[PDB]
Amino acid sequence: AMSKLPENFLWGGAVAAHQLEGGWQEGGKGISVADVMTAGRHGVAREITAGVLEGKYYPNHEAIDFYHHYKEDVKLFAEMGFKCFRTSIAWTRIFPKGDEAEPNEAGLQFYDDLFDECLKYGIEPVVTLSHFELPYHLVTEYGGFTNRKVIDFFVHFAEVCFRRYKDKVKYWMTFNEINNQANYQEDFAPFTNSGIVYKEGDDREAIMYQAAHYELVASARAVKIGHAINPNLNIGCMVAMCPIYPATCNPKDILMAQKAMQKRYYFADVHVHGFYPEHIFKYWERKAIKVDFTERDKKDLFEGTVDYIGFSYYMSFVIDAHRENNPYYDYLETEDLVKNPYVKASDWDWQIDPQGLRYALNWFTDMYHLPLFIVENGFGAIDQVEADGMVHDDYRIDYLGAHIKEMIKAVDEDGVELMGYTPWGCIDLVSAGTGEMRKRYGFIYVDKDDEGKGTLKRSPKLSFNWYKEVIASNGDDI
Amino acid sequence: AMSKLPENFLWGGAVAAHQLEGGWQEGGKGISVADVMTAGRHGVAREITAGVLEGKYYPNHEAIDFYHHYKEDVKLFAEMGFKCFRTSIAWTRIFPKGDEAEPNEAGLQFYDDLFDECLKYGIEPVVTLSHFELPYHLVTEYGGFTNRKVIDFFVHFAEVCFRRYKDKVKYWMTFNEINNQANYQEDFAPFTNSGIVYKEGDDREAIMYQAAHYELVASARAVKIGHAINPNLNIGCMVAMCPIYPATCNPKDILMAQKAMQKRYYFADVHVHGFYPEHIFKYWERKAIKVDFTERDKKDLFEGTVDYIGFSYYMSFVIDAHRENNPYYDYLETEDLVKNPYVKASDWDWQIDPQGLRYALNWFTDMYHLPLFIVENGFGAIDQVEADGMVHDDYRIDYLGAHIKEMIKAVDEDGVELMGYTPWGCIDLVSAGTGEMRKRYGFIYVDKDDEGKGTLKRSPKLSFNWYKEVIASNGDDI
Ligand SMILES: O=P(O)(O)OC[C@H]1O[C@@H](O)[C@H](O)[C@@H](O)[C@@H]1O
Ligand SMILES: O=P(O)(O)OC[C@H]1O[C@@H](O)[C@H](O)[C@@H](O)[C@@H]1O
């Protein structure tokens, strides 16, 4: 009499240090790229400023003060019955500037305290090494991951973490959503993935590919080093999975979708297979893109392939071939996509396609034959607190439950290997794309708004007990 | 000044023994499954009879008498400048019944003669071991490839061929279009792939999966013995690649297409990766399909993976989720497919989709990262001989040229590894599905009709000199 998922399935929740910790200067922590991004809103991009300026609002400085509240917050995770908790180690807490000879003890101690607290309640940490929060010093001084020197800085950081937590953290990922930067047209991904600040005349695409290359090399070096430190460590990649569907069976739409997926997921090919697909080299040739790519890089990549694929899933896309002057079937994320008329969308226009998660799980399995870990899934929405003092987020329950149903079908009917599932922003935190508190994801409401006002009190939403019962039934009761 | 295709590109043409040789009783040849299939036409199935019956017309018995005319025909291939020539070794010429302890010398000598003739002109043989022509005795005595005993019979046959031709044939494939039988609803594929004759009450699908399993094991064992005889032999699989497009971006259509591709191409996963995808095991478990599948089989499959993927391409398909009562997203090739509203079609209703060949080349490359060989592509059409004594088959030139253009883009722009290209039915022969002469594919016209009359004289069509120029220009001039 067993359920459809394995008994040890890793139910949990996921966050990122810069989005919830606050304490942005505590323990000698350095300024991160998140610390120079102002608040925005749907339709209004966050301002990336040259340092911390007066007259600007930086929501990540204080966030929800998890740095101080974590013991109480972790109690809440335990009440829901989390089996794991995904977060990031703030690079700037360990290497404030990035190029220090020795790591920061106060930073390392904080994660000792945090991971110890999780383990007290039987909650396994899942750690992302780089999650959109590299030291700003690496940006101004070195040019971020456009600089081969930054590879060694990351590997140093990774090695320190692997060694410190080798007996406390079983699950690791190197670069959060490493493929986001493929959208090089907008500033968000390049600045966050990679510490790239563009100037007039820059070939944004060529520079993106160079930084992505250095990150893939850094990831591979880190994987090898982590396994040397402890061969039992599970070390994965992390890609944002937004399946791109052809609009119709017109062969042109079909090829557009195939070629768009190729360009957005070559990162996974490198992480998994250890070499670049040939279509990337051909593309670079047509665009006259030159990438500093050495024989040592080739060896590192081949020897540092990942144990599993971590991924985020929120939505799917649709592409067609309506665009003129596209003889090479290039993909422009900002131009070739169209709306899917068969699905609904969030208030931030993120398409709701739970069946796409089943598609995604099958796609990764068929392509790569590795274990998968859904390390983000969530529904960002405006919450209202009712007269009973609780947010009745039936909309969030509906979204999450629909996705859980599809992932269960992938395991039970399709045979995919799925390690676990960690809803994003399980406690309300500062959003990434827009920097809002109002775009809420949590099972736990936090009393703080986009003007920085509120008590910061935590309270369960309707979805809190719902998810508690999901975990307790191992997914049988949704 | 190099061409877009590599210099060593294997331009050629492809046929199958039973479709052109005739001489069906010569040299002690046994009755094959082809020898018990009567002629049909479009919309009229060939009759599969119990032995050779009086009053029935069997077009494969004489075909175009290539058994006697091969020296003159090979000379025409040489005039077109073929780099290679693909055909099959008739299983029934080597093992007339299938279960003989020793091979037939007259059969082996014929292929020595044929391959020698090719090599006199620098034409490299490409050999398919099983191409819809297994010994009919294996059907009646053992139940064809539904019987584990037939594995050893095939491997014996393969070993004999590898040894005899180890220094004459560089390129081999095991089972022609092994995946056709994914369509188990009609009699054709199960009979021709596997020697399956169904009776009332049979679980057609379960029986197919069993025969497919024994063939995949046989293929793996054949690869192993071939490489043991001569490790330089290139031994590939052969799948029919009909890409299955979703009709629309409806997530249900998307999932139907993904699952249909899984069911139609798991054969390739086994040939390439050396293990069955888990979605097959889950499907069998759900459907209560039991397969005789041993640990020795598992080891053989893992050890006997192929060097390259040979495939045929003629058309693409479209699927949708219209069929009711299909909650598990099963694939029925005869019910779930729909017409592509964006394409034209041949007079036998075969959809014309040259871009789908580019999709196909990318799909195999992304999934398997092996060299590919397009070993069939062609346009079957009615030909008229004009007053100048020549068929002006501009329609055939148009189809082949359109496909060549797409394959060149796959190599030049997408970086696929493509070994060569061999148009199907390069000399007019007896068709497979309908057993017609009138459904012509050739660069070379053969004067024989569907009543079996005519001189059997060979004459070039307009496409003959066209293809001669394609090869001479290595595809620069189409
Ligand atoms: O916060 P958003 O903009 O709504 O996006 C949700 C999350 O999904 C991913 O993009 C990131 O890994 C997270 O950092 C981000 O918060
Ligand atoms: O002869 P048909 O029915 O038109 O199909 C063309 C060819 O395509 C493939 O299905 C077979 O491998 C060949 O044997 C066959 O002849």
Author numbering:
A (entry chain B), B (entry chain A): 0 to 477
Task: Quote the passages of the study that discuss this structure, keeping the authors' original sentences.
SmBgl was also crystallized in the presence of the reaction product 6-P-β-glucose. SmBgl–BG6 crystallized in the monoclinic space group P21 with two protein molecules in the asymmetric unit. The final model consisted of residues Ala0–Ile477 in both chains as well as 1145 water molecules, five ethylene glycol molecules, two formate ions and two BG6 ligands. Substrate-bound and product-bound complexes of SmBgl contain a phosphoryl group attached to the glucose ring occupying the phosphate-dedicated cavity. The O3 and O4 hydroxyl groups are both kept in place by Gln18 and, in the case of O3, also by His130. The position of the β-­glucose O6 atom nearly corresponds to the glycosidic O atom of PSC and the O1 atom of BG6.
